[PDB]
Write an enzyme that holds these catalytic residues in place. Structure first.
Site, PDB file in Angstrom:
ATOM      1  N   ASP A   3       0.825  -1.200   0.000  1.00 28.52           N
ATOM      2  CA  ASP A   3       0.000   0.000   0.000  1.00 28.52           C
ATOM      3  C   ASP A   3       0.862   1.253   0.000  1.00 28.52           C
ATOM      4  O   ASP A   3       1.701   1.437   0.886  1.00 28.52           O
ATOM      5  CB  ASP A   3      -0.927   0.032   1.211  1.00 28.52           C
ATOM      6  CG  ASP A   3      -1.710   1.317   1.294  1.00 28.52           C
ATOM      7  OD1 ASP A   3      -2.567   1.554   0.421  1.00 28.52           O
ATOM      8  OD2 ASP A   3      -1.453   2.102   2.224  1.00 28.52           O
ATOM      9  N   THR A  15      -6.007   3.432  -5.304  1.00 28.63           N
ATOM     10  CA  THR A  15      -5.122   4.425  -4.710  1.00 28.63           C
ATOM     11  C   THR A  15      -3.723   4.337  -5.302  1.00 28.63           C
ATOM     12  O   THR A  15      -3.272   5.240  -6.015  1.00 28.63           O
ATOM     13  CB  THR A  15      -5.089   4.213  -3.197  1.00 28.63           C
ATOM     14  OG1 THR A  15      -6.398   4.436  -2.664  1.00 28.63           O
ATOM     15  CG2 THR A  15      -4.083   5.131  -2.522  1.00 28.63           C
ATOM     16  N   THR A  16      -3.020   3.241  -5.019  1.00 24.32           N
ATOM     17  CA  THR A  16      -1.678   3.060  -5.556  1.00 24.32           C
ATOM     18  C   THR A  16      -1.684   2.904  -7.069  1.00 24.32           C
ATOM     19  O   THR A  16      -0.636   3.047  -7.707  1.00 24.32           O
ATOM     20  CB  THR A  16      -1.007   1.855  -4.894  1.00 24.32           C
ATOM     21  OG1 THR A  16       0.273   1.625  -5.496  1.00 24.32           O
ATOM     22  CG2 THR A  16      -1.873   0.612  -5.001  1.00 24.32           C
ATOM     23  N   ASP A  33     -13.453  -1.336   0.593  1.00 22.99           N
ATOM     24  CA  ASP A  33     -13.114  -0.740  -0.698  1.00 22.99           C
ATOM     25  C   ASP A  33     -13.965  -1.316  -1.820  1.00 22.99           C
ATOM     26  O   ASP A  33     -14.590  -0.570  -2.583  1.00 22.99           O
ATOM     27  CB  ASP A  33     -11.628  -0.938  -0.997  1.00 22.99           C
ATOM     28  CG  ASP A  33     -10.739  -0.097  -0.108  1.00 22.99           C
ATOM     29  OD1 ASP A  33     -11.256   0.845   0.529  1.00 22.99           O
ATOM     30  OD2 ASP A  33      -9.523  -0.373  -0.051  1.00 22.99           O
TER      31      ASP A  33
END
Lengths: 102, 509, 508, 67, 517
Positions: free
Chosen positions: B51, B84-85, B377
């Protein structure tokens, strides 16, 4: 000036009762020895209030212990109120002293 | 205070964000290779992450690009969750490509203009890569099953993922409409094994009043309450905090029980099967609540009970301002159920149909803290996917066509558009790189395979880093929710051109 | 690019291995002592590498992995913890090779833990399933283990204790894993190794009886999470005075109720009372507690929340924070709770037998001295560990590294069997093994490189036909004189290498 | 001032607690076999290899102390 | 106590404008990449024009110092063209050392530049239209707020603010007879609404005080009562102990509360405007017990607000509740209770057609950044019209005048000659820097791009057309509708040589050991 005095005044005031506790506390220990010593060999007596109650041995020691304890706690009561009443004097002193003066 | 002008900054804004978009993409992917987390604050104190959101936290980074891209991937956490990443490296595949153009002298303006419509030219090809799988409830449940594991894996859960990949979709299958977290009551709880996690269909109180009060309550009359039994709430039945006597501080505690007695009578004045009180119920009114034969729920949740108020249909007493008037919740049965190591109050058949309560079993908090986030998520994703039920061909199988598309766009056009757009569609084509590279597989051929696929054009087949090589895109789980992608692909696409406005960085530092 | 991470990884490679090495000389009973200085200015002679991880270090994270690594192996087993240091580097030794080859950390990884499975299988049958219902076979094996292993002094003397409290907490013929939970290690200053014993119910620290009951039986064991003294106001109890009229009036209040709160406790059916520490308490006024000791409850006061929780979990006295919160669930039942002063220094309370969830056994390790007490503490420990290792893994695997020397040899050609780019991986994976007893062989002297050439072929031949046996510390039948271990301690020492490496493999 | 010097004076004192004989001595062959075995380990010897032997050798003397 | 020599110092001075004007040069217009700021206190932000950045950026040097100094008057009045003179005066700055490098007086160069502005002034004078009117200037301010609301917060002109820009400036403009004051017009964002929540506010907007909504929400009269006095028993936004010494005083308080409520309901109503702005804070309890009585009661008011809205009304304030007159009440053209956002409370909008001695137009935002990004549009779009009503004069900008005003001046050079032709030449060139620099910040080759309208300048004169500012494939200032207040350009003109004229002032470049210290 009068404001400085009450704080000095109440200081030794509530200081007065707090001390004699220790002598009571002392004799509270003095009786514990004897409440450990008495089996009730001769009639055990608490006296609290204008009545003299019938007292039994076993309830007397925890009482005087509480009495010891309750009193022992009461060194702290004013030792809080000590600095309390001690401080409020000092704060006003230099003011009220100079106020007395001029 | 201090001008930071174009190129040297554009290096710094790149080279950091270049460095940023890497150890995230390093980690990013199922074979995305981990990065040791480093807390310089506490010794080296470490994790090892896939992450990047953790990466930002542990080692603090200063790049304006980063601080932007921080927020982006963060808001891609705040919105898209998973991705996100991925959106991180997304703009990272730009800036390096932009390094050339920037080093080529090429105005960000150009790229600003150019990668922009390039960003769009794929967008509808991306919307073309958007492919409905809602087509049946089962097919959307198949689609619920599609991208569920797709999200949770790169969020670092596998063994206990399967159960949550299972569990979450049905609770969300109750939605059939807007994805509703009101309907979805989150309980993640310590206790139980990795197989003990549970879905309550209804509302659930994970607390238990157990033996002291009623446990099993049918045809529930559920009173959602803010009603202080010790709190001295409105309709105070005894002396409140007020000055009457100098000793009043003691006099307040006396009238408390003569307040607690009358208030239970008021709480009995409704009549109820259960009393759900978001605040304290003391032991004495407890048996007075017991004198009403009612389950006494004290210190009740500030959110679940609200969901309980929403899902079972209850109304909160609101500081006990309604001794009758307040509406009440009704579930068909209230069942205290032993789950994991504790018993949990289960409301079965609550008013809201979409309503559930998920119950997660952490064997410890390390199990309990990590998964339910990762559990979350996909659901937000799925929630979007509930509304618009779609995938995109994964493994770059969406990516190469869009690259192709924008590249096919590119050939004819090339004003400062395709000059950029050519440099753009590469980033569309630069994701399968790292995924096979995190997987450790030569991308070029596989890419050029998948290129020669989407060069030819292709949907049903794309690069699969699982086997490690190109494979079927059947929506195997290998073709993945459009919802994330556009969002992701909406996001870092701007940040580049956005930050391309700021070569003009200035610093009071 | 990924250079720095590779470098880091390379550094990680170099760093942790550079740490993993020196103990390979200390490896085994044939291994050597190590005199550990620190910033402490103290030279400390240590063969055990597990503490050497703990007692001395820097904060290097892959070196942290190591102090992480065997620390698990401590709780994983308590056995092969030094050896799970010995396993990890061997693979990491094979790694930079594959990294000089350039094999990919995912590729490198997935080859290995897989191969470990592939390894443990052939490894498993090398081991011999032994009866876990038979406490003697349990005795024998563990004792044979114990005598194939470091501590036989008190352990073998304590082995009738160890396996028994175990056999007590052994319900199944399987003997499951046998966690140490209900088992309570206790000690007593002095005493004797014979004053050591298992105890069937919880031996407790000291006792409180003023008028309190000394021996109470079938004893409902009270918890107190509430203050019995009344709240502490200016000391333990309720006082408001600037003057004696103030104190003498309200003194009525505090005295009477604390007696009532005391009363209700015995009214709640407490024959024993667990009072956790007066800091874990407000406090107990000993005179109202004397008034409570007058209730002829057995008062154990100032006791650990842990022991509370232990007495909670183990013998089932659950937390009582209130009079109403006294309940038989929260009150354990002590069939006999009576303190005993004997066999060593002073008294600890003895609950003699008890009602317990599962079955709660305890052991009080007493000795010629405190070290001799600790000589038992160490002794029961791994004596119980080999149990947990043998009861969890029935199969009895030989010591001496032969299990590698058979299996590494095996997995190589089975790695070869794989073909694929990866067939090279499991070989070097397997190849990593047999260097471990090699050092151990050299730790016993002689020439492993000569030996491990041969023991390999020996373990290509009869597979156990010869091997490393500590009596020689060299070519011997590991079965002739048994150098043996539970299958667990091995497979214990196994995956942590095939994980933390595979972990550290893909680490940037 | 050396861990050896640390490990020794106790042993001579250990001998010296016992008897005044060997006290100033035993530190001698404490040093002797070290330098002796120092190169042996340096040769092919593993410090474990012959060190048991010197005990087995330590017994021959006591085997001889008998006679 | 070390002393630079003349040209040296100026050579040291010329080291300043270069980079700081450079920052503009890729920031010029929308094709200019706008400016970013970061802080020693750790705040990364985007900046604009000269003023925003050059104030947020801190200025080491007297040159850099005068920037913000020289800058202010620009953005104050016109609001548009701020970033311009930075490049421009910086260009001329680099023209100055140049002619000193060409061996020409610092004296003389600054001389022929001044009236070189005039031949640009007279040149500018001709350009485009020196006229606009109400229905007309609606449309250029549309255009102005096209490029204003399309270049900054959103690139989408949102006609609301585009019209909100026109109306309230007119409102102060038509009040002031084709005069208006940027002070009086005011741009007020409050987030929680939207950048599509945008409000034309010719009066004051404040959240209507509800210590209870249900106790009737209402706005009454059209008029406001501005009070230092209570409309309900008063209190200075500071804690007031509510205790009662007996159980009985518990009973009388809420009556006293309501007795003065109705009395102040009485005495402020008879004064006027039942809606009454009480400068004083007050308990949420009794404030809604008057609400329970009647008349939502405005309490916890900013001390400025009462006098702020007072002076705006032109009316006074009631200092003392025993003093009651409607002039000491305020004047609302319309008091209107207005929900502020969908997210939160109703406000009380006081829109003053009675007198507005301040006009604070309003907007909301989804973010405080964008809402201020929007105000950034709004202020300066309100600034052009500000002058642009005082003179309705507009000139198609963006390099079309720069390519042009240079025409007169550089052609005026050999009309001038001696030193003035130089100070015509090295003057006018600084103009075409910007269309160059605008082509610079664009993806465009400027000299090439400059060459184009050049041919036009030979073909045509003073193009109302020009080069794309929007980087449109077509090049006008007409098709681009890039036209600036024919004040502001010349207003901008006024600035540039002045700076060079400033850097020369006296003969003293010496320092005591104090220069920037």
């Amino acid at each position: 000036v009068e404001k400085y005095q009450q704080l000095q005044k109440d200081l030794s005031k509530s200081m007065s009762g707090r001390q004699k506790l220790e002598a009571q506390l002392t004799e509270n220990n003095i009786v514990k020895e004897e409440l450990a010593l008495l089996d009730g060999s001769n009639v055990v007596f608490k006296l609290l209030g204008p009545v003299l109650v019938k007292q039994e041995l076993g309830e007397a020691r925890a009482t005087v212990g509480k009495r010891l304890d309750y009193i022992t706690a009461e060194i702290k009561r004013y030792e809080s109120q000590l600095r309390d009443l001690e401080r409020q004097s000092e704060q006003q002193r230099e003011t009220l002293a100079q106020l007395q003066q001029e | 205070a201090d001008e930071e002008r174009a190129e040297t900054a554009r290096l710094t804004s790149f080279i950091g964000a270049i460095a940023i978009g890497d150890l995230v993409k390093s980690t990013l992917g199922p074979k995305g290779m981990d990065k040791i987390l480093l807390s310089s604050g506490r010794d080296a104190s470490l994790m090892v992450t896939n992450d990047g959101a953790t990466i930002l936290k542990n080692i603090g980074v200063d790049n304006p690009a980063a601080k932007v891209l921080v927020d982006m991937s963060r808001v891609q956490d705040d919105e898209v969750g998973d991705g996100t990443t991925s959106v991180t490296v997304l703009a990272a595949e730009l800036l390096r490509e932009a390094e050339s153009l920037i080093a080529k002298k090429i105005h960000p303006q150009t790229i600003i203009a150019g990668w922009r419509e390039a960003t769009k030219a794929a967008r509808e090809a991306l919307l073309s890569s958007a492919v409905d799988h809602g087509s049946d409830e089962v097919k959307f449940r198949q689609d619920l099953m599609n991208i569920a594991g797709t999200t949770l894996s790169s969020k670092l859960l596998t063994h206990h993922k399967d159960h949550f990949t299972k569990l979450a979709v049905e609770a969300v299958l109750r939605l059939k409409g807007s994805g509703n977290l009101e309907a979805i009551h989150i309980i993640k709880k310590l206790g139980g094994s990795l197989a003990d996690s549970y879905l309550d269909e209804g509302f659930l109180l994970d607390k238990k009043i157990g033996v002291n009060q009623p446990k099993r309550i049918e045809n529930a009359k559920i009173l959602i309450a803010n009603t202080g039994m010790d709190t001295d709430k409105i309709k105070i039945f005894g002396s409140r905090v007020r000055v009457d006597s100098t000793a009043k501080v003691a006099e307040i505690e006396h009238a408390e029980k003569e307040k607690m007695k009358e208030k239970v009578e008021r709480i009995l004045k409704h009549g109820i099967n259960c009393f759900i009180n978001r605040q304290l119920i003391y032991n004495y009114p407890e048996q007075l609540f017991g004198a009403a034969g009612v389950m006494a729920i004290e210190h009740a949740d500030f959110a679940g009970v609200e969901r309980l108020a929403l899902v079972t249909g209850g109304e909160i007493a609101s500081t006990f301002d309604h001794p009758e008037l307040v509406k009440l919740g009704s579930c068909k049965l209230i069942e205290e159920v032993m789950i994991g190591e504790d018993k949990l109050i289960h409301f079965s058949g609550v008013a809201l149909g979409e309503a559930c309560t998920i119950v997660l079993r952490g064997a410890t908090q390390q199990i309990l803290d990590e998964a339910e986030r990762s559990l979350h998520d996909a659901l937000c994703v799925l929630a979007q996917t509930v509304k618009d039920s779609r995938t995109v061909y994964g493994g770059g199988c969406s990516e190469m066509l869009m690259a192709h598309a924008v590249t096919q766009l590119a050939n004819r056009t090339p004003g400062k558009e395709a000059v950029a757009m050519e440099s753009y569609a590469k980033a569309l084509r630069m994701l399968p790189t790292i995924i096979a590279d995190n997987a450790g597989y030569d991308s070029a051929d596989l890419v050029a395979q998948l290129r020669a696929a989407h060069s030819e054009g292709n949907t049903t087949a794309g690069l699969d880093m699982r086997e490690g090589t190109i494979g079927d895109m059947a929506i195997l789980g290998i073709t993945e929710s459009f919802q994330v992608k556009r969002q992701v692909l909406l996001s870092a696409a701007e940040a580049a051109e956005v930050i391309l406005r700021v070569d003009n960085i200035i610093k009071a530092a | 690019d990924r250079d720095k991470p590779a470098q880091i990884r390379f550094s990680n490679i170099s760093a942790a291995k550079a740490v993993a090495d020196a103990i390979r000389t200390s490896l085994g009973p044939k291994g050597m002592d190590k005199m550990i200085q620190d910033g402490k200015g103290d030279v400390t002679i240590t063969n055990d590498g597990a503490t050497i991880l703990k007692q001395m270090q820097v904060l290097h994270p892959a070196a942290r992995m190591l102090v992480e690594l065997s620390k698990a192996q401590d709780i994983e087993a308590g056995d092969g913890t030094t050896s799970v240091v010995i396993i990890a580097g061997s693979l990491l030794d094979s790694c930079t090779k594959l990294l000089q080859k350039g094999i990919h950390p995912t590729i490198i990884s997935e080859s290995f833990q897989k191969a470990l499975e592939k390894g443990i299988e052939i490894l498993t049958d090398m081991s011999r399933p032994v009866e876990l219902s038979d406490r003697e076979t349990l005795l024998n094996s563990a004792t044979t283990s114990l005598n194939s292993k470091v501590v036989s002094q008190y352990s073998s003397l304590l082995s009738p204790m160890s396996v028994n409290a175990v056999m007590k907490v052994i319900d199944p013929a399987t003997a499951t894993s046998v966690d140490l939970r209900d088992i309570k290690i206790v000690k007593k200053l002095g005493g004797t190794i014979d004053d050591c014993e298992l105890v069937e119910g919880l031996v407790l620290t000291q006792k409180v009886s003023n008028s309190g009951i000394t021996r109470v039986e079938k004893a409902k064991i009270g918890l107190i999470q509430f203050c019995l003294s009344a709240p502490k106001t200016d000391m333990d109890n309720q006082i408001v005075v600037s003057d004696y009229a103030q104190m003498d009036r309200v003194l009525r209040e505090e005295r009477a109720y604390i007696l009532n709160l005391v009363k209700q406790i015995k009214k709640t059916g407490c024959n024993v009372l667990l009072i956790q520490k007066s800091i874990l308490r407000d406090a107990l006024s000993d005179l109202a507690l004397h008034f409570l000791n007058k209730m002829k409850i057995m008062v154990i006061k100032d006791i650990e929340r842990e022991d509370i929780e232990f007495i909670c979990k183990t013998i089932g006295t659950k937390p009582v924070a209130h009079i109403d919160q006294f309940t038989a669930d929260m009150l354990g039942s002590a069939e006999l709770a009576e303190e005993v002063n004997l066999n060593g220094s002073g008294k600890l309370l003895k609950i003699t037998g008890c009602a317990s969830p599962g079955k709660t056994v305890t052991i009080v390790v007493r000795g010629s001295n405190k070290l001799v007490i600790e000589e038992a503490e160490r002794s029961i420990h791994d004596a119980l560990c080999v149990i947990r290792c043998l009861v969890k893994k029935r199969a009895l695997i030989a010591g001496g590294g032969a299990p590698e020397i058979e299996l590494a040899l095996r997995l190589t050609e089975y790695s070869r069997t794989l073909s694929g780019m990866e067939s090279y991986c499991v070989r070097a994976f397997a190849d990593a093994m047999e260097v471990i007893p090699s050092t151990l062989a050299e730790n016993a002297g002689l020439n492993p490189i000569s030996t491990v050439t041969e023991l390999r072929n020996r373990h290509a031949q009869g597979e156990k036909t010869a091997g490393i046996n500590v009596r020689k510390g060299g070519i011997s039948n590991i079965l002739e004189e048994l150098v043996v271990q539970p299958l667990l301690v091995s497979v214990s020492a196994l995956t942590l290498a095939t994980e933390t490496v595979r972990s550290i493999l893909k680490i940037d | 001032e050396h861990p050896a010097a640390k490990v020794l004076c106790e042993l001579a004192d250990l001998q010296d607690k016992e008897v005044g004989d060997g006290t100033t001595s035993v530190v001698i062959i404490a040093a002797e076999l070290l330098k002796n075995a120092d190169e042996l380990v340096k040769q092919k010897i593993h410090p474990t290899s012959v060190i048991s032997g010197y005990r087995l050798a330590c017994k021959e003397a006591v085997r001889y102390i008998n006679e | 106590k070390s002393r630079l020599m003349g040209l040296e110092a100026l050579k040291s001075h010329i080291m300043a404008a270069k980079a700081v004007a450079n920052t503009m040069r890729t920031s010029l217009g929308p094709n200019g990449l706008d400016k970013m700021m970061v802080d020693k206190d750790g705040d990364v932000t985007v900046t604009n024009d000269g003023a925003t950045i050059l104030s947020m950026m801190d200025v080491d040097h007297q040159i850099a110092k005068l920037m913000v100094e020289l800058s202010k008057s620009q953005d104050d009045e016109i609001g548009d063209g701020t970033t311009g003179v930075v490049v421009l005066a910086g260009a001329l700055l680099e023209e100055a050392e140049q002619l000193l490098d060409r061996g020409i007086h610092p004296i003389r160069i600054a001389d022929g530049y001044e009236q070189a502005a005039r031949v640009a002034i007279e040149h500018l004078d001709k350009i485009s239209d020196s006229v606009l009117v109400d229905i007309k200037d609606t449309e250029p301010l549309i255009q102005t707020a096209k490029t204003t609301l399309g270049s900054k917060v959103v690139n989408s002109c949102h006609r609301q603010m585009a019209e909100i820009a026109v109306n309230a400036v007119l409102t102060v403009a038509d009040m002031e007879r084709r005069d208006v004051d940027f002070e009086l017009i005011k741009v007020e964002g409050k987030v929680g609404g939207r950048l599509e929540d945008t409000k034309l506010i010719k009066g004051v907007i404040v959240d209507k005080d509800f210590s209870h909504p249900q106790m009737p929400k209402k706005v009454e009269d059209a008029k406001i009562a501005i009070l230092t006095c209570p409309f309900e028993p008063p209190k200075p936004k500071t804690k007031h102990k509510l205790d009662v010494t007996s159980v009985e005083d518990y009973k009388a308080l809420q009556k006293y509360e309501k007795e003065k409520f109705e009395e102040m309901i009485q005495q402020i109503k008879e004064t006027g405007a039942n809606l009454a702005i009480c400068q004083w804070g007050f308990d949420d309890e009794a404030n809604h017990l008057l609400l329970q009585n009647n008349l939502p009661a405005v309490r916890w008011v900013g001390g400025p607000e009462i006098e702020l809205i007072a002076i705006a009304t032109g009316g006074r304030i009631v200092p003392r509740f025993s003093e009651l007159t409607a002039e000491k009440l305020g004047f609302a053209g319309l008091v209107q209770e207005i929900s502020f956002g969908t997210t939160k409370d109703k406000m009380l909008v006081i829109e003053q057609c009675k007198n507005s001695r301040a006009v604070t137009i309003f907007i909301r935002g989804g973010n405080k950044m964008i809402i201020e990004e929007a105000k950034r549009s709004l202020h300066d779009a309100l600034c052009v019209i500000r002058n642009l009503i005082r003179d309705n004069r507009v000139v198609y900008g963006g390099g079309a005048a720069e390519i042009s005003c240079a025409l007169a001046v550089s052609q005026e050079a050999d009309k001038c000659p001696t030193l003035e032709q130089y100070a015509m030449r090295a003057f006018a060139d600084a103009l075409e820097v910007i269309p160059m620099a605008l082509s610079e910040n664009s993806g465009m080759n400027p000299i090439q791009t400059m060459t184009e309208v050049r041919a036009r300048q030979v073909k045509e004169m003073n193009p109302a057309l020009g080069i794309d500012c929007l980087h449109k494939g077509t090049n006008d200032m007409k098709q681009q509708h890039v036209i600036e207040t024919l004040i502001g350009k010349k207003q901008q003109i006024s600035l540039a040589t002045q700076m060079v004229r400033m850097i020369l002032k006296i003969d003293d470049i010496r320092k005591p050991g104090e220069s920037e210290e």
